[PDB]
């Protein structure tokens, strides 16, 4: 006859060892360092920080190394680590006007006060595989202009001064924190922005692309994309006054969106907002576009695309949840499958009878 044996634990251990060996790869090659990943794979690090929820470059690079480059797994690792960390303080609201700029562009005006700073970007590069990277090379010597940073007013402040757009006013409303309470639909714009920042880059990019193609269009222009170092300050209870704890490299995107004609005020442009850690800006642009799409209830817009369906967009945006639930099908399901089979086998017999 047959006897049951124990195989689960040793199979798990062997699978983990196989995965670890594959992660290490050929031992003749030196092992990758987290510092190298942080410096040279910086855009993957940016995505992992933004979606995992921690703006720590070293931790994101460590997650990428541990995940064998899998962005989804690295993001989940970072989020799981976040769960284990005590919250020591809440930052004072970020002031992007104080950003030390690495890159500042505007698509709405040819030239603006402070100028079109391209900065480090792949924009306008010819995407031809550079095989010289197969061997060690020499970094280029950077050209140096004047060291001063020109006044860079937000382009939306220039639009609002003309009455073409509305200033984003602060009413003192307490932001919703979906990390402490589960989202409740319909969600406030603060909750929506928080979720979108954590959302999958590809999903939101596809939704924004659909909006550009008529599936809930909002006539977007890149009013300004700002990347740079923004100082973080906290008001500790031990002192009672603001202390600057450091600076974070972040990218801010502001989108002008189709004008509206309210009954009691002059017609004006609408807007969307995106904010991400690091330099990767397409996530911020997609965030702004989907934010504007989800603003439909405020503007009484008739939804014409899934990007405007708040529950559908947000419930499936977090790739932690989505990847986990899709991968869970790999778990043993033979009890449930036996139930489905038990029924199907009876339906076959009855149909044949």
């Amino acid at each position: 006859m047959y006897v049951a044996v124990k195989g689960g634990e040793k199979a798990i251990d062997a699978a983990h060892a196989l995965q670890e060996s594959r992660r290490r790869g050929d031992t003749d090659l030196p092992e990758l360092s987290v510092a190298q990943i942080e410096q040279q794979l910086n855009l993957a690090v940016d995505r992992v920080m933004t979606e995992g929820g921690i703006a720590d470059r070293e931790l994101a690079a460590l997650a990428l190394k541990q995940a064998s480059g899998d962005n989804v797994e690295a993001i989940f690792l970072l989020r799981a680590y976040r769960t284990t960390l005590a919250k020591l303080a809440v930052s004072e609201p970020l002031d992007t006007t104080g950003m030390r700029l690495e890159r500042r562009i505007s698509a709405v005006y040819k030239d603006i006060p402070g100028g079109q700073l391209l900065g480090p970007t792949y924009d306008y590069t010819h995407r031809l595989l550079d095989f010289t990277l197969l061997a060690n090379g020499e970094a280029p010597t950077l050209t140096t202009a004047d060291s001063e940073q020109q006044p860079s007013p937000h382009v939306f402040s220039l639009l609002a001064r003309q009455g073409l757009a509305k200033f984003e006013e602060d009413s003192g409303a307490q932001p919703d924190d979906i990390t402490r309470t589960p989202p409740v639909y319909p969600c406030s714009r603060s909750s929506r922005l928080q979720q979108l920042m954590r959302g999958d880059e590809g999903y939101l990019l596809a939704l924004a692309y659909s909006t550009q193609r008529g599936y809930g269009r909002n006539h977007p222009f890149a009013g300004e994309i700002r990347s740079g170092y923004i100082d973080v300050s906290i008001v500790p209870e031990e002192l009672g006054f603001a202390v600057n704890v450091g600076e974070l490299l972040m990218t801010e995107c502001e989108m002008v969106n189709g004008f509206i004609d309210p009954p009691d005020e002059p017609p004006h442009f609408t807007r969307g907002y995106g904010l991400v850690f690091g330099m990767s800006e397409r996530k911020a642009m997609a965030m702004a576009l989907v934010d504007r799409a989800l603003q439909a209830p405020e503007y009484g817009e008739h939804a014409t695309g899934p990007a405007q369906d708040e529950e559908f967009v947000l419930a499936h945006a977090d790739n932690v949840e989505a990847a986990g639930f899709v991968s869970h099908l790999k778990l043993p399901h033979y009890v449930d499958f036996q139930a489905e089979l038990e029924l199907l086998k009876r339906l076959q017999q009855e149909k044949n009878h």
């Binding site: 006859m1 047959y2 006897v3 049951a4 044996v5 124990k6 195989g7 689960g8 040793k10 199979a11 062997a14 699978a15 060892a17 196989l18």
Partner: protein
């Protein structure tokens, strides 16, 4: 008969690691005069897969493919099609394909080059399968 043997040795050469094949060929010190008919060209092989593994065909991307053709002094044409982008490996494979069609080289290289390469690959596969099978989940044993 002969076509199956040629297919076998071409597959062995294609699956061989370029380094080991080059080392083995250098050790054999084969003196052959050949003309390159087609220079080693790196391109794409379009991958056809099947729905459900057995059904209708669909295009599952592409893979890099390198091909080379040589001609020996006696008019024997050697060919190679190998995944990847190693032009020198493709040229060596085509040269060996041409040589193996000659009586004075077939049995010699079948025993000194093709068999030792296939055996080494089989050993690598067996070792990897031994490593992998440790992850098999044991449930029931017949008593």
């Amino acid at each position: 008969a002969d076509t199956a043997t040629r297919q076998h040795w071409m597959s062995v050469l294609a699956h061989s690691q370029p380094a080991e094949l080059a080392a083995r060929l250098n050790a054999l010190n084969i003196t052959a005069d050949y003309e390159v008919i087609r220079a080693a060209e790196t391109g794409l092989v379009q991958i056809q897969a099947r729905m459900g593994g057995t059904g209708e065909r669909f295009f599952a991307g592409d893979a890099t493919l390198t091909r080379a053709a040589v001609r020996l002094t006696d008019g024997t044409l050697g060919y190679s099609w190998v995944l990847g982008r190693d032009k020198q490996h493709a040229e060596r494979c085509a040269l060996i394909d041409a040589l193996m069609q000659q009586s004075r080289h077939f049995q010699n290289l079948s025993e000194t080059l093709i068999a030792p390469l296939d055996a080494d690959r089989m050993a690598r596969i067996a070792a990897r399968q031994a490593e992998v099978n440790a992850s098999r989940v044991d449930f029931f044993t017949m008593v």
